[PDB]
Design a binder for these strands. Structure first.
Length: 265
DNA sequence: CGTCCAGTCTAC
DNA sequence: TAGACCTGGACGG
């Protein structure tokens, strides 16, 4: 999951939970090393927002709910396999690590944070990760300014393909988006980042960091096989036949067409 | 059967 | 940095 998946997971939670009232506790699986959520309320609503590669749930007790409680915020990072599902309460998928249970009246559902590989994390504060830069989807101008004012940072000494994964400057960009973004401008992935960015100090690389991920959000879906076909068809570069690939300095595969670029392994 | 492949996080 | 953290599907023998 990259920026577009975190955003669509947000839209899912807001849409699927619009007319739902939750009750009881927040249940963690016994194998999750993430923290217990100390929250009980007889009647609460769940809402969400995304920022880059993080998602924030707000748990909002209704007027008079008991025990007395203030709203609680949780922030999620999805790692390699995180997702939200709404399922029947007795049809929990495998690897449902955190569960929110609908109160009656109506079909007993669970909203589940599902994470096969368990690289996903949640924190009890409502706070975004300190050090992550602005959202490329929802805070474009702040994102763009934060890169252009910090080109002296040693992060920009690196290949552009490596710099695009650094969540201090490109919060929301992951391995498929870096390939798609670089393929549209035919920028060699191992061109130095500072060269490509001082050059833009006909959409430029920073506009595409916003508009390419926006295109994925516009497809819709992502699971929550027919929209998996839509995604595969949208991809022009990542994993595609006739495309080159190399390992970057952290062993992550960059897909590209043509010239690997000057700092290539 | 086995190998290989798919975002942080933190000891060195 | 390198290895760690994890499960499962595709594919080879």
């Amino acid at each position: 999951p990259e920026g577009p998946e975190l955003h669509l997971a947000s839209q899912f939670v807001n849409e699927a939970c619009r007319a739902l009232v939750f009750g009881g506790c927040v249940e963690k699986s016994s194998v999750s090393r993430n923290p217990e959520v100390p929250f009980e309320s007889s009647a609460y609503r769940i809402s969400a927002s995304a920022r880059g590669k993080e998602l924030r749930l707000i748990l909002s007790p209704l007027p008079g709910a008991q025990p007395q409680q203030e709203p609680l915020a949780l922030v999620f990072r999805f790692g390699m396999s995180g997702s939200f599902q709404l399922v029947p309460r007795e049809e929990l998928p495998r690897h449902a690590h955190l569960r929110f249970y609908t109160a009656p009246p109506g079909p007993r559902l669970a909203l589940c944070f599902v994470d096969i590989r368990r690289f996903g994390r949640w924190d009890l504060g409502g706070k975004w990760q300190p050090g992550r830069g602005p959202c490329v989807l929802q805070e474009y101008q702040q994102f763009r300014e934060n890169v252009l004012r910090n080109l002296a940072d040693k992060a920009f000494d690196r290949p552009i393909c490596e710099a695009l994964l650094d969540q201090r400057f490109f919060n929301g960009i992951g391995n498929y988006l870096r390939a798609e973004i670089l393929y549209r401008l035919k920028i060699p992935p191992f061109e130095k980042a500072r060269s490509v960015l001082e050059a833009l100090q006909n959409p430029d690389l920073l506009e595409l960091c916003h508009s390419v991920p926006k295109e994925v959000v516009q497809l819709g879906g992502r699971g929550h096989e027919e929209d998996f076909a839509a995604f595969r068809a949208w991809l022009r570069c990542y994993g595609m036949p006739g495309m080159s690939s190399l390992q970057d300095r952290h062993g992550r595969t960059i897909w590209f067409q043509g010239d690997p670029g000057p700092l290539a392994p």
